[PDB]
Amino acid sequence: AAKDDLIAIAEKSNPVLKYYDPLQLGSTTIWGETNSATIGFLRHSEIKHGRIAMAAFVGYIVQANGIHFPWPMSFDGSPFPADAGSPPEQWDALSDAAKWQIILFIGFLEWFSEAAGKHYMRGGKPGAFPNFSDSDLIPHPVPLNLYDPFGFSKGKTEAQKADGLIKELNNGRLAMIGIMGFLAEQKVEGSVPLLKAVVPHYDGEVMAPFM
Amino acid sequence: SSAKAELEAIAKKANPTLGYYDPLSLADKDFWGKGNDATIAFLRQSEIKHGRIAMFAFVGYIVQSNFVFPWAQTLAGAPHPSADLSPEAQWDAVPLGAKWQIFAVISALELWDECGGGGALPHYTKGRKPGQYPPFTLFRDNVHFVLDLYDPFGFNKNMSEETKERRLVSELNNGRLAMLGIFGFLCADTIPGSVPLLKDIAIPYSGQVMQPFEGQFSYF
Amino acid sequence: KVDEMPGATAPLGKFDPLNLATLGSESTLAWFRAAELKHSRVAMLATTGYLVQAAGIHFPGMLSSDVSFESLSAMKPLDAWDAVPEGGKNQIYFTIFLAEFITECKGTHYTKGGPLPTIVFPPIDFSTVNPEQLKTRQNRELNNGRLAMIAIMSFVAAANIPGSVPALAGNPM
Amino acid sequence: KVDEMPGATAPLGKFDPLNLATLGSESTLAWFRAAELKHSRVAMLATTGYLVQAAGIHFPGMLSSDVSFESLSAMKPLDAWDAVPEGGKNQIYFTIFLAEFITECKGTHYTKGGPLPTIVFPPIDFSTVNPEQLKTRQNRELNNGRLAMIAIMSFVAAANIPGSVPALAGNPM
Amino acid sequence: EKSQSLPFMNRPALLDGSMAGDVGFDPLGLSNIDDVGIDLYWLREAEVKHCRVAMLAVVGILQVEIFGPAPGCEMATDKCQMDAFWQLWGAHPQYIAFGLIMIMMIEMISGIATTQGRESGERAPGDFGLDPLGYGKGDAAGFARLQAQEIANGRLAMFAAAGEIVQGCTTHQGALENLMTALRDNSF
Numbered sequence: 031a032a033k034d035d036l037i038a039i040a041e042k043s044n045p046v047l048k049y050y051d052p053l054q055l056g057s058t059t060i061w062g063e064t065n066s067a068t069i070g071f072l073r074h075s076e077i078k079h080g081r082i083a084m085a086a087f088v089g090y091i092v093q094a095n096g097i098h099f100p101w102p103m104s105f106d107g108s109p110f111p112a113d114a115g116s117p118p119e120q121w122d123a124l125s126d127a128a129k130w131q132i133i134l135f136i137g138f139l140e141w142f143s144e145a146a147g148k149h150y151m152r153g154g155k156p157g158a159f160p161n162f163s164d165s166d167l168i169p170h171p172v173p174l175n176l177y178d179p180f181g182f183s184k185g186k187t188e189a190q191k192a193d194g195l196i197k198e199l200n201n202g203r204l205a206m207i208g209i210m211g212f213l214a215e216q217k218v219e220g221s222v223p224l225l226k227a228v229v230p231h232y233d234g235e236v237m238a239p240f241m
Numbered sequence: 242s243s244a245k246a247e248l249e250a251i252a253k254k255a256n257p258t259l260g261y262y263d264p265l266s267l268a269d270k271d272f273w274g275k276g277n278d279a280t281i282a283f284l285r286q287s288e289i290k291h292g293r294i295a296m297f298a299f300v301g302y303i304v305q306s307n308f309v310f311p312w313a314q315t316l317a318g319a320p321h322p323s324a325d326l327s328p329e330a331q332w333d334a335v336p337l338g339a340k341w342q343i344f345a346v347i348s349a350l351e352l353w354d355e356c357g358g359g360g361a362l363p364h365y366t367k368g369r370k371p372g373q374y375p376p377f378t379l380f381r382d383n384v385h386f387v388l389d390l391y392d393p394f395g396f397n398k399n400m401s402e403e404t405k406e407r408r409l410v411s412e413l414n415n416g417r418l419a420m421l422g423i424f425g426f427l428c429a430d431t432i433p434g435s436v437p438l439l440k441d442i443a444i445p446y447s448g449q450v451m452q453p454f455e456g457q458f459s460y461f
Numbered sequence: 462k463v464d465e466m467p468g469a470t471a472p473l474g475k476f477d478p479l480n481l482a483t484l485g486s487e488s489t490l491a492w493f494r495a496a497e498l499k500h501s502r503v504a505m506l507a508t509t510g511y512l513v514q515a516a517g518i519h520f521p522g523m524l525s526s527d528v529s530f531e532s533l534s535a536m537k538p539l540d541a542w543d544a545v546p547e548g549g550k551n552q553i554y555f556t557i558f559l560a561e562f563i564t565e566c567k568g569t570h571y572t573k574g575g576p577l578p579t580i581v582f583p584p585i586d587f588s589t590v591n592p593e594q595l596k597t598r599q600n601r602e603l604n605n606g607r608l609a610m611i612a613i614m615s616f617v618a619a620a621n622i623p624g625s626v627p628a629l630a631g632n633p634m
Numbered sequence: 635k636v637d638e639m640p641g642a643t644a645p646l647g648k649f650d651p652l653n654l655a656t657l658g659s660e661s662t663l664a665w666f667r668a669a670e671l672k673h674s675r676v677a678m679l680a681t682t683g684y685l686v687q688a689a690g691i692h693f694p695g696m697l698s699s700d701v702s703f704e705s706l707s708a709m710k711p712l713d714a715w716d717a718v719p720e721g722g723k724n725q726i727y728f729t730i731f732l733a734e735f736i737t738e739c740k741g742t743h744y745t746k747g748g749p750l751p752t753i754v755f756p757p758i759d760f761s762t763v764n765p766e767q768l769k770t771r772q773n774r775e776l777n778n779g780r781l782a783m784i785a786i787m788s789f790v791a792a793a794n795i796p797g798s799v800p801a802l803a804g805n806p807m
Numbered sequence: 808e809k810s811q812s813l814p815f816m817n818r819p820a821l822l823d824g825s826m827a828g829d830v831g832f833d834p835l836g837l838s839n840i841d842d843v844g845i846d847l848y849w850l851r852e853a854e855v856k857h858c859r860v861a862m863l864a865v866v867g868i869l870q871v872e873i874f875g876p877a878p879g880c881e882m883a884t885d886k887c888q889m890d891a892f893w894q895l896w897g898a899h900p901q902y903i904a905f906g907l908i909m910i911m912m913i914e915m916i917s918g919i920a921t922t923q924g925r926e927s928g929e930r931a932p933g934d935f936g937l938d939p940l941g942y943g944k945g946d947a948a949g950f951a952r953l954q955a956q957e958i959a960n961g962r963l964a965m966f967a968a969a970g971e972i973v974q975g976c977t978t979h980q981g982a983l984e985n986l987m988t989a990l991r992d993n994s995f
């Protein structure tokens with residue numbers, strides 16, 4: 031009933047600590063939509079916040095080691111700026127035409143999720159990406175989809191699906207803390223007492239795309 | 242007054258001569274507006290917790306006065322604390338990150354009494370006896386084996402309800418001795434000449450015995 | 462009933478010695494109610510808005526084109542009011558002027574039994590929470606404002622009359 | 635009423651020769667009752683606060699920034715009152731000034747039959763204590779105050795008039 | 808029974824509640840006059856015209872101050888209200904007295920219509936039948952809102968128009984200049 035569902039799924043992620051809500055934000059109606067439509071918003075948010083931090087975790091490591099792509103990106107010839115040698119500075123030193131089109135790419139991917147399928151505030155389920163081939167609001171068909179383009183997951187039964195989402199939730203919750211924890215070490219020395227020195231300091235206000 | 246009569250019965254079984262010592266009768270009402278039942282079993286659990294820590298600090302005090310570990314404390318340098326010197330200041334010689342891992346362990350391990358262990362046993366007012374413990378059996382069947390607290394290999398299975406009560410009162414009166422046991426050690430090691438026969442003091446004081454962090458972490 | 466309502470706590474209960482809640486009608490008491498609610502929220506932001514920056518918190522960059530945040534290195538926090546420029550001091554009032562409207566233009570005014578001043582810009586729906594726990598929060602909200610209404614008057618009297626406040630006069634402000 | 639009142643013990647019983655309990659109303663007697671209750675508690679703390687402050691008990695450390703606890707080595711306990719600084723003397727009165735409020739702002743004031751002045755700090759729950767044995771204590775509380783009201787007047791008269799008190803004048807104070 | 812705007816006094820008898828903006832505000836009884844060729848019909852035809860002229864005059868002052876004059880005019884100056892008016896008259900007075908004769912033809916005919924519109928009650932006060940856009944073939948409740956918004960903006964514009972004229976002739980500066988000056992002095 032969109033409330034028994036949120037309690038039951040947080041229960042399956044943790045026997046003890048069943049349904050945790052101190053600020054009591056799981057009771058709002060947002061803009062003014064029905065409570066059931068809203069709880070879908072809070073869920074679809076938490077997944078989307080958990081998906082990037084999982085992706086930014088693995089991204090943060092590959093930026094640090096030097097598994098950079100070995101060529102130049104631009105037509106004129108300047109290579110990938112792994113010279114700056116640290117993942118926030120590596121995102122600093124780009125061009126006036128690469129930093130856009132990465133956001134502009136994701137800006138199509140974010141957008142395509144509202145249209146082209148059943149919206150999460152009208153039923154459905156949060157974080158469910160609709161396939162490109164099933165919708166008509168695209169001129170040319172792309173070859174493969176975004177999630178699981180090789181079709182492994184369709185052989186798995188339903189009990190391994192709902193159990194799979196909950197493993198994504200808790201890993202999504204852990205990775206949001208990992209990225210933030212990497213942020214605080216960058217801007218505050220000794221912000222967390224595990225990593226003594228692996229980060230350069232760089233007071234560069236990373237929350238801004240375009241300096 | 243069932244909760245009062247449970248406190249009076251165990252006070253007779255601890256000392257039938259002196260009986261019911263109540264020089265403040267604060268075990269018949271409310272502190273936080275929550276209940277006479279909510280007050281007594283909070284104080285019963287309190288005194289139970291005070292003596293369990295106390296006994297664990299008498300045995301811990303003697304051994305640190307006696308032979309203490311060799312072979313290394315930390316990664317780099319590894320100076321072990323002192324052997325003869327006062328255990329109260331052997332606590333101060335423990336390094337920084339060693340201590341914060343101890344208190345973080347004490348915070349979560351003790352917390353498991355409060356929730357009752359994922360439910361299945363209520364909070365200390367009702368149901369459980371004061372000082373009982375939800376036996377880890379929510380954490381242990383989902384990730385790994387951490388055995389159990391206070392019963393690592395449990396041979397404590399089969400006892401009469403009459404025979405447990407002799408051991409229920411062994412928790413109190415030994416700990417009531419162990420509450421004032423420590424104070425005799427701990428007043429002696431800061432001020433000269435208050436203890437009758439204990440002139441085995443380490444020769445300086447301790448230094449703020451209510452300080453977890455005397456070195457390098459001080460408030461302003 | 463003055464005793465049974467948000468703001469009547471344990472150590473005093475119904476605190477009205479000079480009988481001011483009886484002085485008008487029920488619409489009168491509702492006006493004083495949301496006055497103290499609003500007097501609180503201004504004083505809570507001014508007491509806190511005083512401590513911080515008296516300690517040097519210091520927004521990076523420029524406030525305006527040439528009158529950047531040097532207002533914290535030297536002048537007292539009671540000052541740096543005329544140092545803020547006029548166009549900067551204007552937007553502040555007008556965001557407030559606008560916030561006083563939705564407060565007044567609700568479907569039912571508050572003295573007619575309507576709701577008290579709600580958050581103007583981000584209107585997160587607040588209807589849902591347990592009304593037992595809601596009553597404990599409105600006691601917390603007003604008592605912190607009661608303490609802050611006294612405290613902001615302490616901070617003014619220390620800035621005007623030195624030695625007017627004992628354990629607070631030895632403080633650089 | 636005069637009867638069934640704590641404070642009437644064995645060796646005198648009803649002690650009122652000049653008939654002062656009859657002198658007003660019931661509300662008058664309730665004022666004198668909690669006066670003697672409060673006169674007791676001030677005198678019990680001042681008599682006991684005279685005996686120590688005279689044998690050298692001596693808080694370790696500093697009272698204030700430069701006027702540390704040398705007030706016990708030499709000056710009499712009737713002195714060391716101007717030696718305590720003004721900001722130190724001030725917070726004493728104001729904690730008292732606060733404590734006189736909850737005393738007065740109960741739900742029923744005691745001359746209207748309400749309860750006697752109770753503890754401000756740490757109330758717990760009180761004299762739910764077996765009202766037979768409650769009456770024996772309020773006799774014990776007042777009689778010790780009766781003795782202390784005389785005794786603190788002895789301690790003042792010894793500090794002003796030497797030889798005003800025989801087996802007490804040979805005492806360094 | 809009682810005026811909505813002056814709740815301590817009786818509502819005037821002819822203020823029915825039918826005209827837009829009617830809150831019963833007429834303390835001196837001016838709707839009652841029926842002499843010297845004027846009444847509530849003439850007073851309402853007066854008011855709507857005062858509304859309209861003042862609504863155009865406020866935008867006309869703010870236009871040639873924020874953006875300057877139209878292409879073909881030059882030598883822009885301090886205030887746009889008087890200082891430009893005598894300046895243009897001296898520069899090229901043809902377009903300005905073209906309009907004064909064109910207004911004069913419109914006014915002489917709208918004045919006949921007001922006197923003819925009261926004798927036979929088939930001309931609404933203010934109504935010249937100018938609705939080329941068709942707002943009024945729509946909802947009657949939505950058109951009654953448009954009638955009240957014309958009055959409410961027109962009443963506010965009368966103070967603003969008479970404002971900008973008089974403080975233009977007093978301070979000899981622009982209207983947005985006067986607002987920023989008053990902002991400086993009462994900086995508060």
Ligand code: CLA
Nearest residue numbers: 675726728729730732733734737751752753754755756757
């Ligand atoms: C924060 C400390 C504190 C403060 C501000 C007060 C304040 C007050 N007490 Mg009080 N009291 C305290 C502690 C304190 N008490 C304690 C611990 C007890 C034992 C339960 C009492 C028992 C008590 C009685 C019996 C009476 C008062 C009374 C009063 C009032 C007037 C007397 C006065 O000026 O005392 C202010 C000064 C006090 C100096 C001295 C006590 C300060 C202690 C030593 C602080 C340290 C204790 C600490 C909190 C415990 C350590 C554990 C901690 C981690 C929680 C006043 C409102 C009287 C009253 O009628 O109304 C309250 C009265 O008759 N008090």
Ligand code: CLA
Nearest residue numbers: 273275283352353354355356357358360363364365366594
């Ligand atoms: C010294 C102060 C103090 C006191 C008096 C208590 C008292 C209590 N704690 Mg607590 N605690 C303390 C300090 C304290 N704690 C500290 C310092 C920590 C570490 C930060 C904790 C961490 C802690 C945890 C993690 C838990 C408790 C719990 C409890 C409760 C056991 C009884 C119970 O469940 O009642 C019922 C609870 C209440 C009366 C208060 C909450 C009321 C809720 C919001 C609504 C009431 C619903 C219903 C009527 C009763 C609950 C039903 C239940 C099935 C949910 C009790 C209220 C347990 C608890 O409350 O279980 C729910 C619990 O899980 N405590």
Ligand SMILES: CC(=O)O[C@H]1CC(C)(C)C(=C=C/C(C)=C/C=C/C(C)=C/C=C/C=C(C)/C=C/C=C(\C)C(=O)C[C@@]23O[C@]2(C)C[C@@H](O)CC3(C)C)[C@](C)(O)C1
Nearest residue numbers: 078081082085101102103104105132136139140143157159
């Ligand atoms: C001779 C000649 O001309 O050749 C030259 C040409 C040229 C141009 C110079 C060349 C080049 C360089 C190129 C092409 C560089 C390309 C760079 C590229 C392609 C960079 C992609 C970034 C993708 C990101 C960051 C994705 C983030 C994805 C994110 C952040 C997500 O999480 C998406 C998420 O979606 C999920 C999974 C589910 C949703 O519910 C939620 C969201 C939406 C949040 C070459 C190769 O050198 C060759």
Ligand SMILES: CC1=C(C#C/C(C)=C/C=C/C(C)=C/C=C/C=C(C)/C=C/C=C(C)/C=C/[C@@]23O[C@]2(C)C[C@@H](O)CC3(C)C)C(C)(C)C[C@H](O)C1
Nearest residue numbers: 844888889892893914915916917918919920921922923976
């Ligand atoms: C015959 C007839 C009728 C009629 C009629 C009549 C008598 C019609 C006459 C109408 C009449 C006489 C209309 C005057 C307008 C004057 C205006 C608009 C002045 C504006 C002046 C303005 C806006 C400002 C002027 C300035 O001076 C100011 C203030 C400052 C100076 O430094 C200079 C300037 C220029 C800036 C009826 C009544 C309809 C009945 C019948 O049916 C037919």
Ligand SMILES: CCCCCCCCCCCCO[C@@H]1O[C@H](CO)[C@@H](O[C@H]2O[C@H](CO)[C@@H](O)[C@H](O)[C@H]2O)[C@H](O)[C@H]1O
Nearest residue numbers: 463476477478479480481482483484485486487489490
């Ligand atoms: C700073 C200058 C110093 C001057 C200070 C003067 C003190 C002010 C006097 C306090 C009286 C105000 O308190 C107010 O009194 C009025 C009229 O008596 C009461 O009036 C109200 O209750 C009374 C009952 O007494 C009713 O008869 C009356 O119908 C009702 O309006 C209010 O219940 C009370 O809230």
